[PDB]
């Protein structure tokens, strides 16, 4: 994982969008392609549409999400099983 002394990586536009949402009301879905970013407490209770390759799947970030990346909650491959 990322070095501790480098701090968490939030993609610096997701951060600004969630801060603006905090300032103007925590009610909107924030569309982003930043699977790369780190969930932080400052965005807790938001809903973020994380890109998964072809669609911005929405995730409602809760308290326990914080120690995870945004892309962990937007699966990229679909399997459904072999045969049927």
């Amino acid at each position: 994982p990322r070095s501790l002394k480098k701090g968490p990586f939030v993609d610096e536009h997701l951060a600004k969008k969630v801060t603006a949402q905090n300032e103007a009301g925590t009610h909107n879905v924030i569309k982003t392609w930043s699977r790369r970013s780190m969930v932080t407490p400052d965005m807790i209770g938001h809903t973020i549409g994380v890109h998964d390759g072809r669609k911005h799947v929405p995730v409602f970030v809760t308290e326990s999400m914080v120690g995870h990346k945004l892309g962990e909650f937007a699966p990229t491959r679909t399997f459904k099983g072999h045969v049927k």
Partner: protein, 66 residues
């Protein structure tokens, strides 16, 4: 009680290795009882564990970042 069908059952000292000695009765053949832990010694209700859980998911975040 019926004679000859019941086990040996006589006076029996128990020591709990925690400062507790008692004078119960059991079938401990030619011997007594050397317990490992007592009721008033067990960490269950004497209150010496208090595990509950570690549910601070965010608390971990500011622990390693704050």
């Amino acid at each position: 009680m019926k004679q000859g069908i019941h086990p040996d059952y006589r006076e029996t000292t128990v020591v709990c290795t925690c400062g507790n000695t008692f004078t119960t009765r059991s079938t401990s053949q030619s011997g007594t009882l050397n317990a490992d832990v007592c009721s008033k010694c067990h960490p269950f209700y004497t209150g010496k564990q208090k595990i509950l859980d570690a549910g601070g998911r965010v608390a971990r975040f500011e622990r390693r970042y704050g």
